[PDB]
Amino acid sequence: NYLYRLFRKSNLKPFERDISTEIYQAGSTPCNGVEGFNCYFPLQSYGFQP
Amino acid sequence: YAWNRKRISNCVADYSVLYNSASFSTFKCYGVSPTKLNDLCFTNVYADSF
């Protein structure tokens, strides 16, 4: 349930929250928000396990 | 098992040269994002093509 963004185009200003998350594009092979090549999602989960 | 480790050098590196003549299946470089691999100034890359 706890997640953390892993991809973005620009960095953040100090104390900046941004929620808008489409399928990130890792350079070329345009993602068009259609999850093509180089398309990883910024949403990443942790391994919070006992 | 007999993969060649060869030094190629005395020239200029590149990254976008792989988007015109090679129809890709996978394109992964870990430890450094492939994007900067054009400007990256390598020191006698031990080329392993197989």
Side-chain angles (χ1 to χ4, degrees):
Chain A
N1 46 15
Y2 298 118
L3 309 167
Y4 64 110
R5 162 161 322 169
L6 181 46
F7 298 96
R8 213 164 163 270
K9 300 298 180 185
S10 159
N11 297 316
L12 301 180
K13 71 168 278 294
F15 310 144
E16 189 192 12
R17 202 193 304 102
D18 288 332
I19 308 311
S20 89
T21 170
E22 64 93 27
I23 177 73
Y24 181 85
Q25 182 181 333
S28 198
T29 66
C31 207
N32 313 68
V34 312
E35 206 260 330
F37 186 49
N38 318 102
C39 292
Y40 309 143
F41 215 78
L43 268 295
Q44 163 62 22
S45 191
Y46 265 128
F48 291 159
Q49 300 182 353
Chain B
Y1 86 103
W3 61 269
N4 51 351
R5 187 150 76 160
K6 161 182 60 43
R7 186 268 319 279
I8 182 64
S9 282
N10 312 67
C11 51
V12 197
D14 50 1
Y15 152 70
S16 87
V17 80
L18 320 169
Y19 289 89
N20 46 28
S21 159
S23 316
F24 280 166
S25 76
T26 186
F27 190 75
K28 322 285 144 181
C29 183
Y30 308 107
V32 51
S33 94
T35 52
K36 71 207 84 172
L37 271 51
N38 201 290
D39 70 81
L40 291 202
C41 198
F42 285 170
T43 72
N44 301 104
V45 55
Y46 293 83
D48 301 338
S49 175
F50 48 94

